[model samples]
Target: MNIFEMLRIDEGLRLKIYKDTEGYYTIGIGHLLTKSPSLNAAKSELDKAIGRNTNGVITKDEAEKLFNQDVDAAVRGILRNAKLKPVYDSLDAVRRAAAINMVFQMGETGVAGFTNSLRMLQQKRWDEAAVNLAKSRWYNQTPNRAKRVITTFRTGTWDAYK
Candidate 1:
């Protein structure tokens, strides 16, 4: 089954998940709801919650609150950005979801910090992206959650990452 199907998420919900998880919304649950002035602080809180929650199970109300036009636009920005187009183009549906999920959990700037890694991906340097992703202090900082994401990309399993 497609990972989205397995997760029972429509395209809209998928976009919402990406947005809420990414810490983009000004008023919403998770990081998006936090009052911290720093995006990083919100992200840290979100990451802790994500690590605590397994199976991708989130509250229905939280999910509903996140699924909005604003979130969809944010998802589109990440998926359609010129710098990321090649990586997006090359990914299968599953890998695309996994990668976007990672982007969501890490915020654009956090994700963009891996510019060298992304460039490698643009060059079709899969192993190099993997190396950079694995070596990243980002991954080590949140080993359990990050491993699940890394394994999804490495093993070609979308559902696992979600």
Candidate 2:
């Protein structure tokens, strides 16, 4: 997994940099206070990259800039390296986007667990794929998100959650 998802899963959407359990100041997607002696340099570069005085805290604007660099890599890597990459390219834009979002949410290995769902996608069985997606454990835990993804898969729309 790349750092964008790592940051999201690790930090969620914290606007303020806070001390972790180890009592170390961390900010922006597990960006810890490095053990480097040049702490000043590190903070300075962080400030520059995020375009703000992230002395010990950051805003979404700042943190997003600091972490979004890996988003493209994560997207490409997740899709390119997915075990079901064979039929991945067969999906249209909306379904493709939904599948990619699934990879991000369920994780590559977790997505692998969708045996029937992935197979349905390969066969272009759109209805069956949507049903299978909604039947998985991911749906059990997050039905809303799963429905949104499934809706996209079922209907070629950008957002069906609304």
Candidate 3:
């Protein structure tokens, strides 16, 4: 295959602005756009640029085209703060994704507050990490989301975290 094709293949390559592995508003080529100002702006751009509204009035094909064309400016905003890169590296793929998802759902600063969870995660104390997640204000505020994260932390699999 040519370089162009290879590059496309390497990217996540979705046709819609669905949640990515980290639950970012991702689209074709794995574009990440799940932040405050930028995410709201992107929604506005979608309508202005391609006449698509955020009223759930969309078809799959158009969604794909829009995502690919407009996803170029997307930025991976996770892990933008805190020195979690090295800590992230120590995890396995499943755990790594949970970390990313945590950062996505809760900002980097929020993730930093989960001290017990982070501590347990680093020690590979999967169960403790899961419990810690359950005992947080973050969990109370977002129980559904916390459930998924907690499961991933416990199982070390992406089975239900997505």
Candidate 4:
């Protein structure tokens, strides 16, 4: 259990369709199927990933496979961004996991905008970085998850398992 386990706990498992806080048609472990698009398209996306026609109701096994792919995307997203890659590399495993979690929730651009926060993180200024994290709408939107992520950044340990 690494980032995937933490994300699984944070995102929770969903076998069927549900709208995210932003009203996106999200399923699995926070997998954004598409925009205000068709349900069939979402099912198709899930089916293409799992090699089965779940008809909108996916199994836990299928959800897990999808989760892995999503995590890959999150990791790749961070690495591909030239600006974030250096900061990402400067971090330890726990902090790196938190960065990935932030990307997973808000996309690369969203996390990238945490310029001051990332700078504090790069310098290993844990307290300042955690404070920077709390000063954002993302923190307000997902306070619990943000708290764990921020605490992980502050303590340099895994606080996401709880």
Deviation from native of the Cα of residue 38 in model 3, angstroms: 15
* Candidate 1 residue lDDT tens string, 81-137: 766666768777766665665665555657767788777665656666777788887
Winning candidate number (lDDT): 4
Per-residue lDDT of model 4, residues 1-162, tens digit only: 478888888898998977887788878899888786677777787677668777778888877878888899999999999879999999989889889988999899998999999899999999999998899998898798889888988987774565
When 1 and 4 are scored with TM-score, the better candidate is: 4
Give the top-scoring candidate (TM-score).
4
- lDDT of candidates 1 onward, in order: 0.55, 0.63, 0.58, 0.86
Tell me the lDDT of model 4 at 12.
Answer: 89
Q: Compose the digit string of candidate 3's lDDT tens values, residues 127-146.
A: 87788779887778667667
Clash number for each model:
1, 0, 1, 0
Between prediction 3 and prediction 4, which has the larger lDDT?
4
Deviating ranges (above 4 Å) for candidate 4:
37-41, 47-52
lDDT of candidate 1 at residue 84, scale 0 to 100: 66
Give the candidate order by descending lDDT: 4, 2, 3, 1
Residue 12 accuracy (lDDT) in model 3: 38
